[PDB]
Amino acid sequence: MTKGSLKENTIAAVLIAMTVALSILVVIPIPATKGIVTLCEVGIYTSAILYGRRMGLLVGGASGFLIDILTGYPVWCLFSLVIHGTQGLVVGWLLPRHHKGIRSMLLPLLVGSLVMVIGYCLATTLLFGWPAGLASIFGNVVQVGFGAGVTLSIVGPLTRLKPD
Amino acid sequence: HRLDPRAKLMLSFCYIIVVFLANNIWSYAILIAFTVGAILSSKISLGFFLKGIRPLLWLIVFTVVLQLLFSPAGGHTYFHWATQDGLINAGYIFVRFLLIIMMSTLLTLSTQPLDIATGLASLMKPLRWVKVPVDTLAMMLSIALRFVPTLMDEATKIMNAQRARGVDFGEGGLFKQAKSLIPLMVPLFMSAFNRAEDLSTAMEARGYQDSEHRSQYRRDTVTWLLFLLGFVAILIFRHW
Amino acid sequence: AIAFEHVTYTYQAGTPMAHTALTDVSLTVPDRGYLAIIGHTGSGKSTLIQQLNALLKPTSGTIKIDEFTITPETTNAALKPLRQHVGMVFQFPENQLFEETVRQDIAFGPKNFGMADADALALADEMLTTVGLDQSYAERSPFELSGGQMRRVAIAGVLAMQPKVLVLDEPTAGLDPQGRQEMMRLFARLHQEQGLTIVLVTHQMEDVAQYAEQVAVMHEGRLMKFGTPADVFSNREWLQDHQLDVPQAAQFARRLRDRGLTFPKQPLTADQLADYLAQQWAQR
Amino acid sequence: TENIISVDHLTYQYQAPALTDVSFTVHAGEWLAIVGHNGSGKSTLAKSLDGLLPFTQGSVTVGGITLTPETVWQVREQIGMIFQNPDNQFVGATVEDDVAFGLENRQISRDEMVPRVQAALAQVGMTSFAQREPSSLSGGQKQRVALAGIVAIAPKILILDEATSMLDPQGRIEMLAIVRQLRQQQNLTVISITHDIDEAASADRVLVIDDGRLVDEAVPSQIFERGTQLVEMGLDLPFTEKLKAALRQRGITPPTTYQTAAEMEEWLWQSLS
């Protein structure tokens, strides 16, 4: 899978740094009452749709792991590494096609998003606990909605640009 | 209170499964003895602890109260007792919340964010045998980690710049808010691309060339063997 | 227009870790002013700057800017038009670009406050041609432009809001000498022909010597010296110990002073020094 | 002697600007400085010198190893590099790792690496900054520890691709100073593609490029005689030149030949007094 490429190996690092930075920084207050920290998943999904593609799973996983360390709940680090790490890959591998059109991105985003929703739900419902799973479902559903929406909003303009 | 700190990452790795791989009442006595012992050993000063439990307090209340109310028997509208199982289970999940949250805070305050990447590089060593590149992930993770703070300084200045020219960040609802995130996200991505391209030509021209290989610039075994003994003691009783 | 009154600010509020980025700041910048803030990094210059467009509400004291009145009690909602009133240019403004075309990019500014879209695009073209050069660049993508040109596009985007007070956080940074020259002459041009109150945080002493009408010296969150460049640059040694220094014209004037001739005032600029030398040239 | 360049070309004019029929040679330990507008390649030539940016035509040979594809790293060995923007090109988790970064990947070393790193940081004087991460400092300091990092290699050639382009006057003057003392100690060739008049004045020789073609080449003192035309040439005016221009704007005619501050002062005092 990994080679790794000359420029791409650095691009992944920078994008991870960006996602983590945005994760710690940017807060998105929902209309009562939680927040949307996983706008980093915008960076994840976008990194998966841009070039992307399979390799974007690094930008998904390592970043989320670091987020778990920094935000932070270090105990969940492996879980997030797996959930996000596979999430970005589910978006990436399912994406092409040839990036043509919005729907072409709309379909794989739905599947990859469920990996987070179902993943964290099972992650919660393990140490926990019947209500924690439901709460995780709701929160991560709103969060997935925001992330996918923003990603869809950006990825258009970006594909026209983008180095490689 | 710093230590190895390479083993703390393994603590973060194992504490998750160790947490639920134990019923009772007895393994809880072992677990609490271990955790409280670690807390007392590592200073604290419960301020950051209680302030750490503070945001998740709503989730603790929600989970415990739902685990209760959906158990005495609650469903089909009837309370009283029989329920006690749900009571002690709610207590179990409450103490569970306390343990996981406080240990999360302790682990957060323990390690300095720097050496964690090198620790990851050290722990990924066996993975070398599985053909998985270790040094590439190590360099990538180190560069990313060191670029995390400087990208925060960048993300703030971009937001301030856009706010200065009319962009109203943070305001509701959600669609109009997500549309507002674009003038922040788009510049950052393109800046990240330039950040990498300049870094690629930098590393290429630098003394480090195209390598990927190969060069790298007593309390350890104690607490981990203690962790092993405690973990075995937990493995003894577990009701299954 | 601008008027600080016993202003002070601190990260982060009363709770630790406390760090007063500013303390007891009082000053007044008149209409058509041209303030130049000088000092080291982290000396409170950036805080003083962000204090203008209400990016940072003061912990104490008041900030009167024309009709506006900034106070610690002031809410975020009421400070909405203050941003269109006070334009700002952060260091390396190119980064603020994002639109697919420079026309819509420059027009994006007013569009948030107002705005009639067609009038916004037309105003975007107007600002496009008023900034440096950039004629008919409207259809071209900003990312395709050079660094300096992108800086001109961003600056035009800021100017599109029709601000009465322009703020510049080291705008000539990274630019080639011609870029810096043309940009500074652009700022002076807007200053003299349009409004225009202009705040200018820099390190280049020459631009302050030539263009600035008044100087504000910062040093760890406190406005120590304040006044005309003649008053500020009068005491050289004070600046020397503050790791600053008088302009090259003043230094060379001291060089000609030790030899030495006399001058009615300390020459801050090569033009002034040339005048003072020309008079004595006519005499002797 | 050290850097022979008979012919050079770049096909991007059909990104990095352009180059056509560029030709020059760099002497040993020579303080070279390349200047020009924006239409000039400049940074293009800087990219071509190290090894990156594969040219379509021409040939460049760093004495004595010739370019490019197979011997690129061989040429890159004896060549230090400093780029603009010190936030980038740092790559290290901290100053120490940043300095050791260049040393690391040459199959050596581990044990002898440490005292060499400490000696380099001692040489730049930032020894008390190895503990600090780049996300805390400073502008000229990150560039200075990048300079320490590349000087840890101790190459025969050093390239400054506008290192002081994005620095405060403090960090810029300081950097130029430590580069001067570095020249004093190690004695090495320093090619600096910049637009800083102080650096160009520090140079022993100045190449002026325009439209991808080397239009001029002379001693900095002779280059400064271009007066007001210096800005268009992408280089600030010496204050003596500013004063002379301001004087000829006022009837007084100063000497055409370039003069330092001391010479200008002496001539001025000689005139009226």
From Swiss-Prot, chain B:
Chain coiled-coil ranges: none
Keyword Iron recorded: no
Superkingdom assignment: Bacteria
Keywords: Cell membrane, Membrane, Transmembrane, Transmembrane helix, Transport
Cellular-component GO terms for this entry: plasma membrane
Molecular function (Gene Ontology), one example: transmembrane transporter activity
Membrane-spanning parts: 16-36, 55-75, 87-107, 132-152, 220-240
Disulfide topology: none
Bilayer topology annotation: Multi-pass membrane protein
Family: Belongs to the energy-coupling factor EcfT family.
UniProt name for this protein: Energy-coupling factor transporter transmembrane protein EcfT
Organism of this sequence: Levilactobacillus brevis (strain ATCC 367 / BCRC 12310 / CIP 105137 / JCM 1170 / LMG 11437 / NCIMB 947 / NCTC 947) (Lactobacillus brevis)
Curated annotation (Swiss-Prot), chain C:
Superkingdom: Bacteria
Enzyme class: translocase
A GO cellular-component term linked to this record: ATP-binding cassette (ABC) transporter complex
Predominant location category: membrane
Membrane-topology descriptor: Peripheral membrane protein
CDD domains tied to this protein: ABC_cobalt_CbiO_domain1
Residues that, per the record, bind ATP: G39, H40, T41, G42, S43, G44, K45, S46
InterPro entries from the UniProt entry: AAA+_ATPase, ABC_transporter-like_ATP-bd, ABC_transporter-like_CS, ABC_transpr_CbiO/EcfA_su, ECF_ABC_transporter_ATP-bd, EcfA2, P-loop_NTPase
Record EC number: 7.-.-.-
GO molecular function: ATP binding; ATP hydrolysis activity; ATPase-coupled transmembrane transporter activity
Gene3D superfamilies: P-loop containing nucleotide triphosphate hydrolases (3.40.50.300)
Alphabetic keyword roster: ATP-binding, Cell membrane, Membrane, Nucleotide-binding, Translocase, Transport
Function of the molecule: ATP-binding (A) component of a common energy-coupling factor (ECF) ABC-transporter complex. Unlike classic ABC transporters this ECF transporter provides the energy necessary to transport a number of different substrates.
Record-stated family: Belongs to the ABC transporter superfamily. Energy-coupling factor EcfA family.
Complex formation: Forms a stable energy-coupling factor (ECF) transporter complex composed of 2 membrane-embedded substrate-binding proteins (S component), 2 ATP-binding proteins (A component) and 2 transmembrane proteins (T component).
Name of the protein this chain belongs to: Energy-coupling factor transporter ATP-binding protein EcfA2
Highest classification ranks of the organism: Bacteria, Bacillati, Bacillota, Bacilli, Lactobacillales
Gene from which the chain derives: ecfA2
UniProtKB/Swiss-Prot annotation, chain D:
Keyword list, A-Z: ATP-binding, Cell membrane, Membrane, Nucleotide-binding, Translocase, Transport
UniProt xrefs under Gene3D superfamilies: P-loop containing nucleotide triphosphate hydrolases (3.40.50.300)
Keyword Membrane appears in the UniProt entry: yes
Entry-linked CDD domains: ABC_cobalt_CbiO_domain1
Compartments it resides in: Cell membrane
Record domain ABC transporter: where: 5-236
The protein's Enzyme Commission number: 7.-.-.-
UniProt-listed SUPFAM superfamilies: P-loop containing nucleoside triphosphate hydrolases (SSF52540)
Topology versus the membrane: Peripheral membrane protein
GO MF annotations, alphabetized: ATP binding; ATP hydrolysis activity; ATPase-coupled transmembrane transporter activity
GO CC term, one of those recorded: ATP-binding cassette (ABC) transporter complex
Residue sites binding ATP per the record: G36, H37, N38, G39, S40, G41, K42, S43
Signal peptide span: none
NCBIfam families xrefs: ECF_ATPase_1, PRK13635.1, PRK13648.1
Task performed by this protein: ATP-binding (A) component of a common energy-coupling factor (ECF) ABC-transporter complex. Unlike classic ABC transporters this ECF transporter provides the energy necessary to transport a number of different substrates.
Quaternary context: Forms a stable energy-coupling factor (ECF) transporter complex composed of 2 membrane-embedded substrate-binding proteins (S component), 2 ATP-binding proteins (A component) and 2 transmembrane proteins (T component).
Record-stated family: Belongs to the ABC transporter superfamily. Energy-coupling factor EcfA family.
Descriptive protein name: Energy-coupling factor transporter ATP-binding protein EcfA1
Organism: Levilactobacillus brevis (strain ATCC 367 / BCRC 12310 / CIP 105137 / JCM 1170 / LMG 11437 / NCIMB 947 / NCTC 947)
